[PDB]
Tab-separated table of C-alpha atoms in Angstrom:
chain	number	residue	atom	x	y	z
B	262	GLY	CA	145.096	87.320	138.409
B	263	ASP	CA	142.986	90.484	138.192
B	264	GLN	CA	141.097	90.263	141.497
B	265	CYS	CA	142.515	93.601	142.690
B	266	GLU	CA	140.680	95.433	139.874
B	267	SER	CA	137.420	95.394	141.889
B	268	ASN	CA	139.113	97.150	144.836
B	269	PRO	CA	138.635	94.400	147.464
B	270	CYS	CA	140.805	96.163	150.067
B	271	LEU	CA	138.730	98.484	152.259
B	272	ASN	CA	139.631	101.484	154.399
B	273	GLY	CA	142.636	102.679	152.362
B	274	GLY	CA	144.241	99.270	151.881
B	275	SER	CA	146.310	98.389	148.802
B	276	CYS	CA	146.106	95.195	146.809
B	277	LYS	CA	148.491	92.752	145.147
B	278	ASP	CA	147.349	90.073	142.674
B	279	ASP	CA	148.967	86.674	143.110
B	280	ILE	CA	148.400	83.749	140.713
B	281	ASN	CA	145.540	82.074	142.649
B	282	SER	CA	144.314	84.880	144.875
B	283	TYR	CA	145.051	88.400	146.099
B	284	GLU	CA	146.397	89.985	149.249
B	285	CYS	CA	145.558	93.223	151.012
B	286	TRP	CA	147.998	95.499	152.741
B	287	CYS	CA	146.102	97.373	155.447
B	288	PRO	CA	146.956	100.706	157.064
B	289	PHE	CA	147.513	100.976	160.817
B	290	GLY	CA	144.023	100.817	162.375
B	291	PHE	CA	142.510	98.108	160.164
B	292	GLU	CA	143.030	94.382	159.758
B	293	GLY	CA	141.461	91.274	158.254
B	294	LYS	CA	141.813	89.871	154.742
B	295	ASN	CA	140.016	92.926	153.257
B	296	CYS	CA	141.063	95.472	155.941
B	297	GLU	CA	137.406	95.242	157.043
B	298	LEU	CA	138.029	94.938	160.815
B	299	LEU	CA	139.235	97.549	163.307
B	300	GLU	CA	142.724	96.816	164.725
S	165	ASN	CA	123.713	108.930	106.212
S	166	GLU	CA	121.987	110.637	109.139
S	167	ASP	CA	118.540	109.754	107.795
S	168	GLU	CA	119.296	106.057	107.396
S	169	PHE	CA	120.606	105.919	110.969
S	170	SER	CA	117.514	107.681	112.312
S	171	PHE	CA	115.147	105.285	110.500
S	172	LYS	CA	117.004	102.241	111.829
S	173	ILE	CA	116.940	103.464	115.456
S	174	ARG	CA	113.317	104.644	115.418
S	175	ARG	CA	112.208	101.337	113.865
S	176	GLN	CA	114.033	99.458	116.650
S	177	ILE	CA	112.365	101.637	119.306
S	178	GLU	CA	108.844	101.285	117.839
S	179	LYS	CA	109.198	97.506	117.632
S	180	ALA	CA	110.709	97.085	121.121
S	181	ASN	CA	107.951	99.127	122.743
S	182	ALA	CA	105.123	97.530	120.728
S	183	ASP	CA	106.341	94.078	121.822
S	184	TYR	CA	107.017	95.082	125.451
S	185	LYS	CA	105.048	93.499	128.310
S	186	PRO	CA	105.438	94.380	132.028
S	187	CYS	CA	107.488	91.955	134.145
S	188	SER	CA	104.477	91.517	136.457
S	189	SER	CA	100.713	91.932	135.945
S	190	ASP	CA	100.508	94.284	138.950
S	191	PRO	CA	103.306	96.843	139.605
S	192	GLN	CA	103.697	95.896	143.318
S	193	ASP	CA	104.572	92.326	142.214
S	194	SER	CA	103.188	90.572	145.310
S	195	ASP	CA	104.251	87.103	144.085
S	196	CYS	CA	107.875	88.098	143.295
S	197	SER	CA	107.459	87.123	139.630
S	198	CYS	CA	109.290	90.029	137.949
S	199	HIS	CA	112.688	88.281	137.649
S	200	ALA	CA	111.442	84.691	137.975
S	201	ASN	CA	112.292	83.705	134.377
S	202	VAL	CA	115.997	83.994	135.208
S	203	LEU	CA	116.020	81.732	138.286
S	204	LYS	CA	113.839	79.172	136.456
S	205	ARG	CA	116.281	79.069	133.531
S	206	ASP	CA	119.299	78.937	135.903
S	207	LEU	CA	117.853	75.937	137.828
S	208	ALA	CA	116.340	74.152	134.773
S	209	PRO	CA	119.437	72.051	133.928
S	210	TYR	CA	119.093	70.339	137.347
S	211	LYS	CA	115.367	69.564	137.091
S	212	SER	CA	115.453	66.045	135.558
S	213	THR	CA	118.316	64.550	137.637
S	214	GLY	CA	118.364	66.831	140.698
S	215	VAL	CA	121.459	67.578	142.784
S	216	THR	CA	123.426	64.751	144.441
S	217	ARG	CA	125.847	64.914	147.363
S	218	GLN	CA	128.644	64.121	144.908
S	219	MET	CA	127.739	67.149	142.751
S	220	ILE	CA	127.930	69.382	145.837
S	221	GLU	CA	131.251	67.861	146.976
S	222	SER	CA	132.591	68.209	143.423
S	223	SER	CA	131.429	71.865	143.208
S	224	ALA	CA	132.866	72.869	146.609
S	225	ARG	CA	136.231	73.886	145.127
S	226	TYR	CA	134.498	76.634	143.080
S	227	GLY	CA	133.215	78.814	145.927
S	228	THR	CA	132.449	79.320	149.596
S	229	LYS	CA	130.404	76.520	151.123
S	230	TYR	CA	127.342	77.637	153.047
S	231	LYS	CA	125.117	75.165	154.848
S	232	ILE	CA	121.694	75.809	156.305
S	233	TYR	CA	121.153	73.043	158.872
S	234	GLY	CA	118.492	73.069	161.586
S	235	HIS	CA	117.716	76.703	160.806
S	236	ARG	CA	121.293	77.695	161.564
S	237	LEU	CA	123.799	79.049	159.021
S	238	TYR	CA	127.233	77.452	158.715
S	239	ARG	CA	130.130	78.341	156.408
S	240	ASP	CA	133.731	77.533	155.486
S	241	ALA	CA	135.991	79.292	158.015
S	242	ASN	CA	137.892	80.805	155.071
S	243	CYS	CA	135.833	83.237	153.006
S	244	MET	CA	137.927	84.471	150.062
S	245	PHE	CA	136.230	87.914	150.247
S	246	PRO	CA	135.007	88.478	153.855
S	247	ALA	CA	133.289	91.766	153.000
S	248	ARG	CA	131.301	90.017	150.232
S	249	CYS	CA	130.358	87.157	152.583
S	250	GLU	CA	129.015	89.813	154.983
S	251	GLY	CA	126.834	91.270	152.215
S	252	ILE	CA	125.500	87.832	151.292
S	253	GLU	CA	124.902	86.868	154.934
S	254	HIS	CA	122.762	89.984	155.410
S	255	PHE	CA	120.224	88.382	153.081
S	256	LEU	CA	120.638	84.724	154.112
S	257	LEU	CA	120.416	85.223	157.889
S	258	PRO	CA	116.777	86.476	158.024
S	259	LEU	CA	115.660	83.521	155.849
S	260	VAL	CA	117.346	80.673	157.758
S	261	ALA	CA	114.534	80.479	160.365
S	262	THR	CA	112.019	79.477	157.631
S	263	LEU	CA	114.229	77.622	155.131
S	264	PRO	CA	114.833	73.852	154.977
S	265	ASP	CA	118.321	72.354	155.031
S	266	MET	CA	120.612	72.878	152.035
S	267	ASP	CA	124.224	73.111	150.917
S	268	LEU	CA	125.121	76.167	148.818
S	269	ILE	CA	128.416	76.701	147.031
S	270	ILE	CA	128.497	80.482	146.668
S	271	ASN	CA	131.231	81.913	144.511
S	272	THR	CA	132.228	85.381	145.770
S	273	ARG	CA	134.787	86.049	142.991
S	274	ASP	CA	133.840	88.461	140.192
S	275	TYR	CA	134.088	85.827	137.475
S	276	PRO	CA	131.832	82.759	137.134
S	277	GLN	CA	133.281	79.288	137.581
S	278	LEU	CA	131.299	76.681	135.602
S	279	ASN	CA	132.261	76.890	131.942
S	280	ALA	CA	129.625	75.055	129.890
S	281	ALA	CA	132.298	74.413	127.207
S	282	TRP	CA	134.188	72.399	129.812
S	283	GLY	CA	132.113	69.597	131.052
S	284	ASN	CA	131.571	67.240	133.998
S	285	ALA	CA	133.634	68.362	136.871
S	286	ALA	CA	132.004	71.687	136.231
S	287	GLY	CA	128.387	70.557	136.326
S	288	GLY	CA	127.581	72.511	139.498
S	289	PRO	CA	125.460	73.740	141.155
S	290	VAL	CA	127.465	76.901	141.901
S	291	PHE	CA	126.020	80.368	142.619
S	292	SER	CA	127.696	83.454	141.094
S	293	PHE	CA	126.564	87.097	140.766
S	294	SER	CA	127.288	87.384	137.054
S	295	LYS	CA	127.365	85.130	134.020
S	296	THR	CA	126.925	84.738	130.290
S	297	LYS	CA	125.517	81.835	128.257
S	298	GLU	CA	129.046	80.327	128.465
S	299	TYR	CA	128.525	79.545	132.182
S	300	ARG	CA	126.248	77.248	134.195
S	301	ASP	CA	126.501	79.264	137.434
S	302	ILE	CA	123.182	80.184	139.085
S	303	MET	CA	122.854	83.963	139.489
S	304	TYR	CA	122.203	85.477	142.900
S	305	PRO	CA	121.746	89.114	143.890
S	306	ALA	CA	125.209	90.523	144.518
S	307	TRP	CA	126.629	91.168	147.978
S	308	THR	CA	126.845	94.872	147.184
S	309	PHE	CA	123.081	95.352	147.585
S	310	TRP	CA	124.065	95.403	151.275
S	311	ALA	CA	127.850	95.521	151.534
S	312	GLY	CA	131.301	94.797	150.138
S	313	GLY	CA	131.272	96.341	146.655
S	314	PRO	CA	134.437	98.075	145.404
S	315	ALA	CA	136.116	100.413	147.895
S	316	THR	CA	136.893	103.968	146.812
S	317	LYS	CA	137.557	107.257	148.599
S	318	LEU	CA	133.827	108.134	148.598
S	319	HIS	CA	132.937	104.587	149.744
S	320	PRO	CA	135.924	103.380	151.798
S	321	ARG	CA	133.966	100.462	153.312
S	322	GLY	CA	132.913	99.337	149.824
S	323	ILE	CA	129.897	100.440	147.819
S	324	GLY	CA	126.813	99.006	149.509
S	325	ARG	CA	123.475	99.917	151.091
S	326	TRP	CA	121.388	100.009	147.920
S	327	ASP	CA	118.437	101.014	150.133
S	328	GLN	CA	120.229	104.248	151.089
S	329	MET	CA	121.606	104.795	147.586
S	330	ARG	CA	118.096	104.609	146.059
S	331	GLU	CA	116.897	107.454	148.324
S	332	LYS	CA	120.019	109.520	147.652
S	333	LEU	CA	119.620	109.174	143.865
S	334	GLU	CA	115.819	109.734	143.887
S	335	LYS	CA	116.503	113.064	145.617
S	336	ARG	CA	119.284	113.988	143.226
S	337	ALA	CA	117.209	113.029	140.137
S	338	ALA	CA	114.484	115.365	141.494
S	339	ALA	CA	117.088	118.143	141.940
S	340	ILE	CA	118.478	117.911	138.363
S	341	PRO	CA	115.547	117.457	135.966
S	342	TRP	CA	116.165	116.380	132.377
S	343	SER	CA	116.274	119.903	130.925
S	344	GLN	CA	118.988	121.010	133.403
S	345	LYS	CA	121.293	118.040	132.749
S	346	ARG	CA	124.322	118.642	130.521
S	347	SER	CA	123.960	117.398	126.921
S	348	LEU	CA	127.183	115.347	127.006
S	349	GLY	CA	128.128	111.684	127.306
S	350	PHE	CA	129.681	110.842	130.659
S	351	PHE	CA	131.793	108.067	132.101
S	352	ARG	CA	134.198	108.006	135.042
S	353	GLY	CA	135.586	104.578	135.904
S	354	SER	CA	138.653	102.364	135.621
S	355	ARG	CA	140.057	100.275	132.783
S	356	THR	CA	138.529	96.925	133.801
S	357	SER	CA	137.852	96.069	130.147
S	358	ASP	CA	139.328	97.373	126.891
S	359	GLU	CA	135.737	97.679	125.551
S	360	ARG	CA	135.879	101.065	127.384
S	361	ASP	CA	138.831	102.487	125.389
S	362	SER	CA	137.098	104.023	122.348
S	363	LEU	CA	134.793	106.172	124.552
S	364	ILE	CA	137.788	107.578	126.469
S	365	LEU	CA	139.682	108.241	123.219
S	366	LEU	CA	136.617	109.943	121.705
S	367	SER	CA	136.420	112.182	124.806
S	368	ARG	CA	140.064	113.193	124.367
S	369	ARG	CA	139.409	114.139	120.742
S	370	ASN	CA	135.987	115.725	121.311
S	371	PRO	CA	135.439	116.781	124.964
S	372	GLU	CA	132.437	118.872	123.901
S	373	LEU	CA	130.596	115.623	123.005
S	374	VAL	CA	131.884	113.177	125.652
S	375	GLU	CA	133.422	113.616	129.104
S	376	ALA	CA	135.000	110.187	129.723
S	377	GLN	CA	138.169	109.604	131.754
S	378	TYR	CA	139.884	106.624	133.360
S	379	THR	CA	140.287	106.441	137.112
S	380	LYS	CA	142.868	104.179	138.765
S	381	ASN	CA	141.847	100.902	140.484
S	382	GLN	CA	143.710	98.781	143.077
S	383	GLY	CA	145.084	96.517	140.310
S	384	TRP	CA	146.948	99.359	138.587
S	385	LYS	CA	150.268	98.128	137.168
S	386	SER	CA	151.376	100.773	134.596
S	387	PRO	CA	150.346	103.956	132.697
S	388	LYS	CA	148.753	101.648	130.084
S	389	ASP	CA	145.942	101.143	132.662
S	390	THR	CA	144.830	104.750	132.031
S	391	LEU	CA	145.954	104.761	128.361
S	392	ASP	CA	148.955	106.943	129.351
S	393	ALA	CA	146.926	109.815	130.865
S	394	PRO	CA	146.974	111.077	134.459
S	395	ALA	CA	144.442	109.140	136.557
S	396	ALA	CA	141.168	111.069	136.943
S	397	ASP	CA	139.386	111.502	140.269
S	398	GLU	CA	136.362	109.469	141.364
S	399	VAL	CA	133.012	111.154	140.647
S	400	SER	CA	130.100	110.337	142.960
S	401	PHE	CA	127.009	108.550	141.616
S	402	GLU	CA	125.057	111.677	142.628
S	403	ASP	CA	127.259	113.811	140.360
S	404	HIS	CA	126.661	111.484	137.367
S	405	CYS	CA	123.109	112.793	137.416
S	406	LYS	CA	124.208	116.179	135.992
S	407	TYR	CA	124.757	114.477	132.576
S	408	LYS	CA	122.037	113.423	130.110
S	409	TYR	CA	123.910	110.487	128.579
S	410	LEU	CA	125.471	107.903	130.923
S	411	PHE	CA	127.585	104.985	129.704
S	412	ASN	CA	127.907	101.530	131.225
S	413	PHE	CA	130.327	98.790	130.239
S	414	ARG	CA	131.107	95.299	131.423
S	415	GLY	CA	134.152	95.102	133.687
S	416	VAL	CA	135.676	91.862	134.886
S	417	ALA	CA	132.121	90.625	134.615
S	418	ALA	CA	128.940	92.728	134.895
S	419	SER	CA	129.326	96.157	136.527
S	420	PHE	CA	127.560	97.453	139.653
S	421	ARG	CA	127.573	100.901	138.025
S	422	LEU	CA	124.603	100.113	135.755
S	423	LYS	CA	121.754	100.170	138.313
S	424	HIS	CA	122.984	103.513	139.713
S	425	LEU	CA	122.827	105.250	136.356
S	426	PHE	CA	119.089	104.605	135.880
S	427	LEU	CA	118.207	106.365	139.147
S	428	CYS	CA	119.666	109.644	137.812
S	429	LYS	CA	116.775	109.761	135.296
S	430	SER	CA	119.503	110.049	132.668
S	431	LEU	CA	119.539	108.102	129.430
S	432	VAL	CA	121.624	104.972	129.959
S	433	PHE	CA	123.797	103.616	127.142
S	434	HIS	CA	124.599	99.977	128.021
S	435	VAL	CA	127.439	98.504	125.992
S	436	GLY	CA	127.431	94.743	125.299
S	437	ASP	CA	124.676	92.191	125.858
S	438	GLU	CA	126.599	89.183	127.273
S	439	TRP	CA	127.401	89.884	130.938
S	440	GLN	CA	124.359	89.617	133.211
S	441	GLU	CA	123.172	90.196	136.710
S	442	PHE	CA	119.873	88.569	137.761
S	443	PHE	CA	117.777	91.651	136.935
S	444	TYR	CA	119.172	92.419	133.451
S	445	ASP	CA	116.766	90.041	131.670
S	446	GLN	CA	113.821	92.362	132.409
S	447	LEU	CA	115.759	95.494	131.410
S	448	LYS	CA	114.705	95.669	127.770
S	449	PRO	CA	116.712	97.446	125.077
S	450	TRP	CA	115.059	100.524	123.586
S	451	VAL	CA	112.380	100.386	126.342
S	452	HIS	CA	114.607	101.127	129.374
S	453	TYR	CA	118.000	101.944	127.827
S	454	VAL	CA	120.012	102.408	124.649
S	455	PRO	CA	121.912	99.236	123.681
S	456	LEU	CA	125.285	99.406	121.967
S	457	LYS	CA	127.161	96.402	120.570
S	458	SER	CA	130.471	95.420	122.221
S	459	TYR	CA	133.566	97.390	121.150
S	460	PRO	CA	131.674	100.378	119.771
S	461	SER	CA	133.499	102.647	117.363
S	462	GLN	CA	133.993	106.366	117.845
S	463	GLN	CA	131.752	106.913	114.777
S	464	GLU	CA	128.983	104.811	116.344
S	465	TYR	CA	129.140	106.944	119.511
S	466	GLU	CA	128.993	110.161	117.441
S	467	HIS	CA	125.934	108.908	115.511
S	468	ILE	CA	123.958	107.674	118.481
S	469	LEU	CA	124.662	110.747	120.636
S	470	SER	CA	123.820	113.071	117.699
S	471	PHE	CA	120.537	111.219	117.187
S	472	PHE	CA	119.415	111.552	120.811
S	473	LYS	CA	120.596	115.178	121.053
S	474	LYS	CA	118.210	115.860	118.110
S	475	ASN	CA	115.382	113.717	119.477
S	476	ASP	CA	115.301	114.929	123.030
S	477	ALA	CA	111.730	114.056	124.046
S	478	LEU	CA	112.323	110.479	122.858
S	479	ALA	CA	115.529	110.389	124.932
S	480	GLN	CA	113.665	111.556	128.047
S	481	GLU	CA	110.899	108.898	127.573
S	482	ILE	CA	113.400	106.024	127.540
S	483	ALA	CA	115.314	107.553	130.452
S	484	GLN	CA	112.062	107.855	132.415
S	485	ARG	CA	111.061	104.254	131.730
S	486	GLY	CA	114.514	102.981	132.836
S	487	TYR	CA	114.314	105.035	136.015
S	488	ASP	CA	110.829	103.690	136.695
S	489	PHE	CA	111.855	100.071	136.139
S	490	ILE	CA	114.735	100.186	138.642
S	491	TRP	CA	112.596	102.206	141.069
S	492	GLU	CA	109.708	99.722	140.982
S	493	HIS	CA	111.469	96.388	140.333
S	494	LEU	CA	114.873	96.652	141.988
S	495	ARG	CA	113.650	97.530	145.458
S	496	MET	CA	115.273	95.906	148.493
S	497	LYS	CA	112.040	93.904	148.653
S	498	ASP	CA	112.774	92.584	145.140
S	499	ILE	CA	116.318	91.547	146.166
S	500	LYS	CA	115.133	89.806	149.322
S	501	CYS	CA	112.217	87.978	147.668
S	502	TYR	CA	114.438	86.829	144.762
S	503	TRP	CA	116.885	85.284	147.247
S	504	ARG	CA	114.000	83.558	149.024
S	505	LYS	CA	112.358	82.269	145.841
S	506	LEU	CA	115.717	81.092	144.446
S	507	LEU	CA	116.608	79.123	147.570
S	508	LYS	CA	113.107	77.591	147.918
S	509	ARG	CA	113.210	76.279	144.325
S	510	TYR	CA	116.828	75.109	144.646
S	511	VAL	CA	116.292	73.017	147.787
S	512	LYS	CA	113.654	70.930	145.946
S	513	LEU	CA	116.419	69.801	143.564
S	514	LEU	CA	118.477	68.163	146.342
S	515	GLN	CA	118.441	64.347	146.118
S	516	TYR	CA	120.225	63.722	149.420
S	517	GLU	CA	120.006	64.365	153.162
S	518	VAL	CA	122.025	67.392	154.308
S	519	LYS	CA	124.296	66.354	157.198
S	520	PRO	CA	126.259	68.591	159.562
S	521	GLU	CA	129.992	69.152	159.046
S	522	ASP	CA	132.044	70.025	162.111
S	523	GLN	CA	134.837	71.898	160.270
S	524	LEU	CA	132.331	74.615	159.233
S	525	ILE	CA	131.857	77.645	161.519
S	526	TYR	CA	128.569	78.966	162.896
S	527	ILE	CA	127.452	82.253	161.298
S	528	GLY	CA	123.978	82.795	162.771
S	529	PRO	CA	121.413	83.942	163.671
């Protein structure tokens, strides 16, 4: 997939494209699927 | 060579502007009619038969299910892009008090879901931000008008707050009038479509004509993603306004960049005519912007830039009209009233009684 191209991971997160979907890696301090929540 | 090109372009401009009519009779657009042609055309395929429960159940796999029931908003627990759901919910929540019941399958992915070449299981209705004639998806104003656009260093929470951005760009357009803008083409964005390549390559060969460089996005996999050059830094939307000639390209689908460029009072060069957002129909080529066909050549860029560099008052007129259109007809009020008008017309299509579903979560208000 190419879902990571639109930078869906907020707050300094990094993104990996899977086949169906994507996943965010979030830095210490943020959580949620898009790193959109405070930890 | 140069003369033939000039004649062709000036003919196209004269014709476009002679044929042009305003999107509403009055500029304030009290009845929210400016972009109404789009929502009518998007809902038209459902007019004769309406929307059945089966069509909704069948469409559910293509997006995030929202349900307005009893003036309360419900949703799938799992939103694929939570930050985009937040942007959408900003607009839905204020309307739920005065909206009848409905089920909405809202796709929050970049790419539309209902290919009109395929058929049957992909009959919809499904709502998506961007489409072409190849897709049956109903366009809605993107999340990013409030929240959840792409995240960058200058916008770590995602590009959003179009209300604030409008004021920021109005002020910056006032600070850098036409005559003080640099007479160069400008683009600073990532390689989300190879339609962007020839502009970047032209810039490398002729930096005095075009300043175009690839940034890196979160999907970066190899140096090929910047055509083997070091990744350039992000440039703010404000700083785009120092250039006279601003380029926009499709990305995965339509790009959120486009609307920002107009508010610089720069001349916008919009490449391709397929990928839409809901407001693109009333942006008219040669009236509000300079259209270029998909996959432009370096020679095409050289010709069109040379023409406008030599016809500077004409360039400023188009740029001014584009600015004015986005200023007057892409207000927050226009976004909010489009949402409302869309949903009110859609609900009339439903040929079934909306029932609660306990697995959905309560959103608000």
